[model samples]
Structures are given as structure tokens and as C-alpha cells.
Target: VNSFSGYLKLTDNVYIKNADIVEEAKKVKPTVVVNAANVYLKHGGGVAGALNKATNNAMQVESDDYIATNGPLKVGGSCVLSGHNLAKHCLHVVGPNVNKGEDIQLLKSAYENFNQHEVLLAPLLSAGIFGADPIHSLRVCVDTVRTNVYLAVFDKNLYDKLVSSFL
Candidate 1:
């Protein structure tokens, strides 16, 4: 595992950090990496796309297979799959698209749907192309993730926003 450098600690388990989630995920072992995904499990872009590309599209292929058998993943839903180069397993989660309509609970559900893994490396959810507010998304994450979560925030502005909040 990469050195656990926490910029902020909300609890013994939760951390707010300046880190690359995928790289951390790749470095960590037996730990589950969390993916920001759509209900389709397309692994098309953003974090999803990155993981897929890293794995030579195996992530998407497996996800597509899972959906083909299971059904489209619902908003606030999650499923696990082999992370390939990322980690032994990857957990895919879907948050409500704010552009579709405001649903804080759906975002909360995305956080709430976490698996009972000891080390969960997750990026901020739904605050990008999904159009969620970073501050609000950060709050949802802090509130609903019940266990350990190393939140690897890519956006320095969002990270600093939390830092400011801490003051």
C-alpha cells in the first residue's frame, strides 16, 4: 500500500487526502477500489474509463457480462468485480446524476452501498460530469460511508474546500 497520508481525518477510518485513487488502488492489495460508474456499467469514461483502459477493457467486458445477466445497475446501486491491475476487486457504485434531478438520498445511497471491506479507496462521487456540487458531495460522503474509506480527492479545489471547512 502507498503511504497513508491523510490531509484530514473525520474518523479513525475515513480520510480526506490529496492522492490519485487509481494509482493507490493499484498499489494496494486485497483492498477494494471504488469506481464512479453509471447504471449501465459501461466503464466508459472518467474513473470508470480509466480502470477499463488500465485493464485492457476487461473491466468493461466483465461489467457488461454482469449486466447482461443481472440487469442494468440502478442508481445508488453497487457491484463488485476483479479490478485486474487495480486491485483484487473493484467496487462499482452509481450516484444520481444531479442534472437528471436533485436527489441527495440517491447520492447518499451511493455512499451507503459500500461493501464491508477493510480498506476502501474511493474517489469523490458524482461531482464531475454528473454535475453534483463538490461541497455537498463531500458532505454526503462524510455522512454515509459508515466504515473505513480513504477518499482520494483529485480536485485540489475540492480538497482545499474541505481544508477551509476544517478551519
Candidate 2:
């Protein structure tokens, strides 16, 4: 780990960051930060909760309002909202859950729909609580998202594992 720079190149413009998304995302000040959200757009845990916490729960409030106005967010569907205190905007994409019979394409669609901007921060969509393997999820994300991407990771164990695997 001595030479680790906390960064790994995934493609011409995409990268993997061995870092916490909230901190790195706020630092880069991207046009938007991608959230691995559910169909209901609730900020229950994982990346949603972290961003909501960073903005003092305002993110959740905004997402709730968005859901209220537009109805439930669907797989491959995305909604943009103010990040409040973090990035300029937050792109909420409803990631796929394999357990729900969702496929990788939906998760890939989530990554492909970051039209709000090119430079952005995103975690591995559909991984962990969403039921996709990290390696599999990252593969879909890396292949789909183009332009500048800071694919941040929170878990140190996962970070180390990713570093060993990718870098």
C-alpha cells in the first residue's frame, strides 16, 4: 500500500478511487454525483444515506419531493436534484437488484444515464445491498460510463481487494 495513489484507471476517462465518495465527490465539485438508489428513491442506507448525511438530510428531502412529484423512480430511470452542500447536483439512478430479477443492463443504464455532466463521482452500482457482486458491478459501470469518472469506494476491505485486482 505504500505506493498506492488511491486511483486506478478503468478506461480512457473512467477511474476507480480507493476513497470515500462523499469526501472525494465534494472535493472535485463535479456537475453531479451519482447515487445508487432504489425505485422508491429513499435514502435508507449506503451511498444514499451518506450523501443525505453530508447535506444534513436535505438530499433525502429533495429526493422525497422528486418522488412525490414524478412518481417512483424506475430501473434505468434517473432524477437530478441539488446536492445541497456537496456536488453541484445529485443524479439519482435506480440501480438494478438481481434478487428482484433485474439484469446488469439496468445497472449499466444507470451508469450510462449521467447526462447531467461528464465529470462525476459514483460508487459501484447494484453492489452490496443491491445484490450484485462488486467485481461484476464495477465491470458494468466501467464499461458504460464515459468521460471523467471518480468511482469511489467506501469499504477499506473492498478498496484493498479492488486495488489488488485492478491496479
**Candidate that scores best on lDDT:** 1
Report lDDT per candidate.
0.78, 0.77
TM-score of 2: 0.87
Top TM-score: which candidate number? 1
Which tens-of-lDDT digit does each residue in 48-142 have in candidate 2?
88888888888888778888898998798888888787878888888888878897677777777864476777888887688888887777766
Prediction RMSDs, each to the true structure:
2.2, 3.8
lDDT for 27 in candidate 2 is 72
List runs of model 2 lying over 4 Å from the truth. 1-6
List the candidate 1 regions with Cα displacement exceeding 4 Å.
Answer: 1-3
Candidate 1, residue 159: how far the Cα is off, in Å: 1.4
Alpha-carbon TM-score of each model against the true structure: 0.89, 0.87
Model 2's C-alpha root-mean-square deviation from the true structure amounts to 3.8
Model 1 — which ten-residue stretch has the worst lDDT?
Answer: 1-10
